[PDB]
Amino acid sequence: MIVPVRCFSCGKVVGDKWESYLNLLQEDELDEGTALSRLGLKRYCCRRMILTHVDLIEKFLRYNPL
Amino acid sequence: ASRHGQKGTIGITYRREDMPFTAEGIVPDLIINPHAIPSRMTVAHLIEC
Amino acid sequence: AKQNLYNAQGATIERSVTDRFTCGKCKEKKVSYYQLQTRSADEPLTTFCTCEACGNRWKFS
Ligand SMILES: [Zn+2]
Ligand SMILES: [Zn+2]
C-alpha cells in the first residue's frame, strides 16, 4: 500500500514526504526521530503515520501481470 | 476491539468541530467510556497507551 | 480422656472479618467476606458478605 494521503487525525498532506523520509535514512545515516523532526512534522498525530506505515505495494509489485 | 478483549461497536459519529479537542489541536479518533477500565481490570491497555 | 474430648469436637472455621460495611439487619460493622466469580467471564467477582454481629448474609455487586 501507498502512504496515506492526508493524516486521518489532522489532515495535513502526507505522501509527498515518503520517499524523502526514505532517503533521509538511506544515505544520510540519520536517526529517524530527528529525521521526522527535520522533515517537519511537529504534532504527533501526523507523526505516527510515517513512522508506522508499511509499504506492501512493492511486494505486490514484484509479480509479473500481463 | 483492542488487543485486550475490549470489544465494542460504534455508537454514533461526530466531526471535528464538535469532537473534543486538546490544546495542540490533536482531535481524537475515538472515545471509549471509562467504566470499561476497572471491572475488566485491563491495566496493560493503559500501559500500552 | 482429655485428648478424646478434644478430638470429639470438630471443625471450627472462623470467618475472618473487616469493619467497612454494616449489617443488612442488625446494622453493625463486624463484616466478613469472600471472593470468587460465579457467572461468565465478562464480569468480576461476587463479593460475598457474612455479618458476624448477628450472622446475617447479604451481597454487593
Ligand atoms: Zn495529523
Ligand atoms: Zn448483623
Side-chain angles (χ1 to χ4, degrees), chain A, chain B, chain C residues 1-41 44-61:
Chain A
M1 307 310 179
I2 313 299
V3 297
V5 233
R6 17 167 48 184
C7 179
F8 311 149
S9 64
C10 79
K12 194 169 176 72
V13 286
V14 177
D16 45 0
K17 295 163 184 39
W18 170 240
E19 81 286 11
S20 301
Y21 162 67
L22 270 296
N23 47 69
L24 268 292
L25 303 180
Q26 286 316 110
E27 67 271 21
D28 292 325
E29 183 65 26
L30 190 54
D31 175 81
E32 55 86 21
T34 78
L36 278 75
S37 306
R38 291 183 50 264
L39 194 41
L41 295 173
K42 73 194 295 291
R43 288 186 308 271
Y44 72 107
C45 78
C46 298
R47 176 180 262 229
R48 61 151 183 178
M49 294 233 108
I50 286 307
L51 197 108
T52 194
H53 156 268
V54 71
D55 187 273
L56 297 182
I57 175 65
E58 55 88 18
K59 299 268 212 296
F60 290 165
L61 202 52
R62 294 182 67 250
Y63 286 123
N64 196 359
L66 310 190
Chain B
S2 79
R3 291 181 292 172
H4 308 259
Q6 298 292 318
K7 70 186 291 183
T9 175
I10 297 93
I12 60 155
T13 51
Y14 286 112
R15 275 79 50 83
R16 305 172 61 198
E17 62 267 20
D18 56 357
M19 195 76 55
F21 71 103
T22 182
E24 309 205 71
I26 309 289
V27 61
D29 301 307
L30 74 164
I31 296 90
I32 59 177
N33 185 282
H35 300 76
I37 294 313
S39 303
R40 310 276 191 167
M41 268 220 180
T42 182
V43 175
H45 182 279
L46 264 50
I47 282 184
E48 191 217 342
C49 195
Chain C
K2 182 265 290 180
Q3 196 173 2
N4 279 323
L5 196 144
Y6 180 75
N7 301 341
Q9 59 88 28
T12 43
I13 189 70
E14 71 272 15
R15 306 306 167 201
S16 70
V17 298
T18 179
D19 50 348
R20 43 193 64 251
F21 321 126
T22 190
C23 170
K25 329 280 188 159
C26 79
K27 303 165 105 187
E28 274 89 7
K29 293 179 147 207
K30 286 166 184 179
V31 298
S32 54
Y33 65 95
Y34 181 137
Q35 61 90 25
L36 188 139
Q37 56 93 26
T38 293
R39 73 280 191 191
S40 183
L45 309 167
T46 59
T47 77
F48 288 155
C49 311
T50 313
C51 178
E52 316 296 322
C54 63
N56 181 25
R57 187 262 175 188
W58 68 91
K59 190 176 179 180
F60 208 105
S61 189

